[PDB]
Amino acid sequence: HMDLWKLYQPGTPAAIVAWGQLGTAHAKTTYGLLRHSRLFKPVCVVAEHEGKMASDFVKPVRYDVPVVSSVEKAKEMGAEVLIIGVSNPGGYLEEQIATLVKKALSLGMDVISGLHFSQQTEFLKIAHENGTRIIDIRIPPLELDVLRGGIYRKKIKVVGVFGTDCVVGKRTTAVQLWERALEKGIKAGFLATGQTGILIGADAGYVIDAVPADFVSGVVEKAVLKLEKTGKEIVFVEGQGALRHPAYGQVTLGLLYGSNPDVVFLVHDPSRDHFESFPEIPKKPDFEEERRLIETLSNAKVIGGVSLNGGFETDLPVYDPFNTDDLDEMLERAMVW
Amino acid sequence: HMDLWKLYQPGTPAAIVAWGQLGTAHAKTTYGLLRHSRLFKPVCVVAEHEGKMASDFVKPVRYDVPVVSSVEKAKEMGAEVLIIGVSNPGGYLEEQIATLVKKALSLGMDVISGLHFKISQQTEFLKIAHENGTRIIDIRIPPLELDVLRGGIYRKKIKVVGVFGTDCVVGKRTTAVQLWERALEKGIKAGFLATGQTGILIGADAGYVIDAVPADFVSGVVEKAVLKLEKTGKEIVFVEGQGALRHPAYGQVTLGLLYGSNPDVVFLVHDPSRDHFESFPEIPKKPDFEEERRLIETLSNAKVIGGVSLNGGFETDLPVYDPFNTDDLDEMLERAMVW
């Protein structure tokens, strides 16, 4: 529905809200922005720690910025938009965030959020009452359709960055690839599939986990064809879950069908004896099985493994996404055929 | 938390709306009800054909009822609820249906619908409803309180029979219902887990319209429904499949269903005459029995114990069952039970 690039000029200064989660795993969106934000220019972090720096809570970071405790101080520093960089907080934290949102809207600042609340009556009233807007990137479009076949007639090269579990470095790997292609002059696109990828400046995408099941593959197809229309020669697709994950495989399958990748990089953490957070599913992530399933369900070739923590045995090369030679190799290989 | 058996008494007289689609493939919900409604007692069909019978547009039927052209006539015949039995109509027909709904609500009748209307129509339905002590039950909207699959399905006791297919619209639901009715007739404590509009309206013991559930929760919702049927004492469950794993527009739904129900055995419904997935002539792929079978087995612990056909046989090492044949229904049931 909302294209952040059609609404904001590149380098639009942004204040990022990490209230109550700064220094925890839950502020992943704030971390993605401070390390890779491409559209918005981070100016500060809004959290309860007056006088500190972002670097004092998370390291390393590309945009080290001050931590301010009020939206007012954030506006004093030229912040024009408020980005919600927290993930599923308790009802009490949620209320403090809603206050921050209301304040921003009332101080002439737009609010970009992918968090689910409910309080959308008041945000709209105050947005309209102050000429600001609340951009909800999580709500799926109302005008939707299922996949119709356009993806089978694509021209653009599609690179799926899949994984064997959730939270293994899929997005990090797709973003590293994207940034490297861009630095080499390649007309590269990034198709985000969640909150963080969108906020960092993805060229296209949706929060697919909130999309009614029937339309997952349809919206992914639309996103790939949108990037083709804007002149991109290649796209890095942020994977979600894993095909073998019993709670999320459906999402991963919709994504695979929707993007019809030419090649795939498979991200894996070989230390997990259970899917992360699912200690009661007698099943673990498996590189060769995921790979086998990916290839047997589509025409994609898994051309490489990727790891952010420890290698593993496989006939495929295992790349490190923070190694520039590996990035260059992966890129070169994705455009050979 | 939505169950029709909790809301309506068995035998509740219903008027079924087939307006603009009676005699077409699109009125499948109307057909499912006239052939197998188990909760609601069909009283009449609401369509633009005054003076005819249901049987004049569709044959065979279990509940042949008159076709009336107004909601007023429907209530004159004791209909207490209005069921929407059409599937994705044009905006024009949708408007006529919205009129029917508003009338029903205004004549003291509840409305049960699984059709996606515009917000304008929805908001206006809730207003009318509120004011007449009537209610509009929307079976399509998913619950707000939802969670992902947690693993309870792996500690299940109930026997689970998946009725899958190589495409959409092949007889999956028909096969599941035929089995369910046969088990019940034999005294078996059998449950039917519906996954779409029609299955729920027919009187399924559990289920949701899974295609409208956010992607993340499909397997979780199916897990809950299977454990619910186990907790209420059922010894076996027939799961209405949705789509096919190989269907590029719908495989995701089928995979959520497979993981969420963790079937022991699967019956695979197939129409061997299809050169493409029904309604997707621009997708260069088609239903494939062996491939689908292979994919079901390689993605779960289910064993595909049989093929099913409603129109012509096909080669396969598995037996190919006819769901209208009583011996086949008995055979299929015995093989799933004993498993």
Strand order of the sheet with strand B265-269?
B206-207, B190-194, B236-240, B159-165, B265-269, B303-308, B320-321
Degrees to nearest 5, angle at CA B62 with B60 and B64: 85
**Residue A278 contacts B, CB cutoff 8 Å:** yes
Contact A107, A75 (CB under 8 A): yes
CA–CA separation, B182 and B267 (whole Å): 15
B293 interaction partners in chain A (CB closer than 8 Å): none
A145-337 carries CATH number 2.60.40.10: no
Q: Domain map of chain A by residue range?
A: 1-144, 145-337
Q: For chain B, how are helix, strand and coil distributed in percent, rounded to 5?
A: 40, 15, 45
Q: What element of type H or E holds B110?
A: strand B110-113
Contact A318, A311 (CB under 8 A): yes
Q: Is the dihedral of CA B294, B296, B300, B305 positive or negative?
A: negative
Q: For chain A, how are helix, strand and coil distributed in percent, rounded to 5?
A: 40, 20, 45
Residue with tokens 């219902």: B177
Q: What letter does residue A53 receive in the DSSP assignment? A: B
Contact B224, B232 (CB under 8 A): no
Q: With a CB-CB cutoff of 8 Å, which residues 129-188 of chain B face chain A?
A: 148-154
CA–CA separation, B219 and B150 (whole Å): 9
DSSP per residue over B33-46, as a string? HHHH-SSSEEEEEE
Distance of residue A4 Cα from the nearest chain B Cα, in angstroms: 23
Of B211, B252, B295, the CB nearest to A217: B252
B150 interaction partners in chain A (CB closer than 8 Å): 247, 278, 280-281
Q: Going along A87-166, which residue ranges are E strands?
A: 110-113, 134-136, 157-163
A299 interaction partners in chain B (CB closer than 8 Å): none
CA–CA separation, B73 and B93 (whole Å): 20
Tell me the one-letter amino acid at A25. A
CA–CA separation, A204 and A223 (whole Å): 6
Q: Count of A–B CB contacts within 8 Å? A: 121
For residue B73, count other CB atoms closer than 10 A to its CB.
Answer: 16
Contact A242, A248 (CB under 8 A): yes
- The answer to whether A250 contacts B250, with C-beta atoms less than 8 Å apart, is no
Distance of residue A51 Cα from the nearest chain B Cα, in angstroms: 39
Phi, psi of B91 (to 5 degrees): -55, -35
Degrees to nearest 5, angle at CA A90 with A87 and A92: 125
The arrangement of secondary structure in B147-339, i.e. its CATH architecture, is: 3-Layer(aba) Sandwich (3.40)
**Residue A224 contacts B, CB cutoff 8 Å:** no
B256 interaction partners in chain A (CB closer than 8 Å): 213, 249-250
Of B212, B219, B295, the CB nearest to A247: B219
The arrangement of secondary structure in B1-146, i.e. its CATH architecture, is: 3-Layer(aba) Sandwich (3.40)
Of B220, B256, B283, the CB nearest to A152: B283
B153 interaction partners in chain A (CB closer than 8 Å): 246
**Is it true that A1-144 and A145-337 share their CATH fold?**
yes
Q: What letter does residue A306 receive in the DSSP assignment? A: E
**Residue A253 contacts B, CB cutoff 8 Å:** yes
Going by C-alpha positions, the residue among B85, B131, B124, B125 that lies closest to residue B108 is B131
A1-144 belongs to which CATH class? alpha beta
CA–CA separation, B91 and B112 (whole Å): 19
Return the bridge partners of B236, or none: B159, B190
CA–CA separation, B11 and B27 (whole Å): 22
* Residue A293, phi-psi category: left (phi > 0), alpha (psi -120 to 50), beta (remainder): alpha
For A241, the closest chain B residue by CA position comes to B216
Method used to solve the structure: X-ray
For residue A45, count other CB atoms closer than 10 A to its CB.
Answer: 31
Of B119, B151, B282, the CB nearest to A280: B151
Residue with tokens 């009676």: B22
A250 interaction partners in chain B (CB closer than 8 Å): 215, 218-219, 252-253, 255-256, 259
- The answer to whether B215 contacts A211, with C-beta atoms less than 8 Å apart, is yes
Of A149, A213, A293, the CB nearest to B215: A213
CA–CA separation, A228 and A189 (whole Å): 9
Contact B68, B46 (CB under 8 A): yes
Distance of residue B284 Cα from the nearest chain A Cα, in angstroms: 8
Going by C-alpha positions, the residue among B151, B255, B155 that lies closest to residue A242 is B255
B195 interaction partners in chain A (CB closer than 8 Å): none
CA–CA separation, B109 and B129 (whole Å): 9
Structure-block tokens of residue B69: 């052209």
A213 interaction partners in chain B (CB closer than 8 Å): 210-215, 218, 252-253, 256
Structure-block tokens of residue A235: 């796209």
Give the mutation candidate from B216, B217, B219 for the A interface (greatest A CB count, under 10 A).
B216
Of B153, B255, B295, the CB nearest to A250: B255
CA–CA separation, B233 and B248 (whole Å): 37
Helix residue spans in B203-288 (DSSP H): 218-231, 251-261
Contact B180, B167 (CB under 8 A): no
Q: What letter does residue B211 receive in the DSSP assignment? A: G
Residue with tokens 């807007």: A133
Give the mutation candidate from A250, A277, A298 for the B interface (greatest B CB count, under 10 A).
A250
A296 interaction partners in chain B (CB closer than 8 Å): 295, 298
Of B151, B252, B282, the CB nearest to A250: B252
CA–CA separation, A213 and B195 (whole Å): 12
Data resolution in angstroms: 2.7
For A274, the closest chain B residue by CA position comes to B151
Going by C-alpha positions, the residue among B96, B254, B247, B85 that lies closest to residue B162 is B254
**Residue B91 contacts A, CB cutoff 8 Å:** no
CA–CA separation, B193 and B328 (whole Å): 21
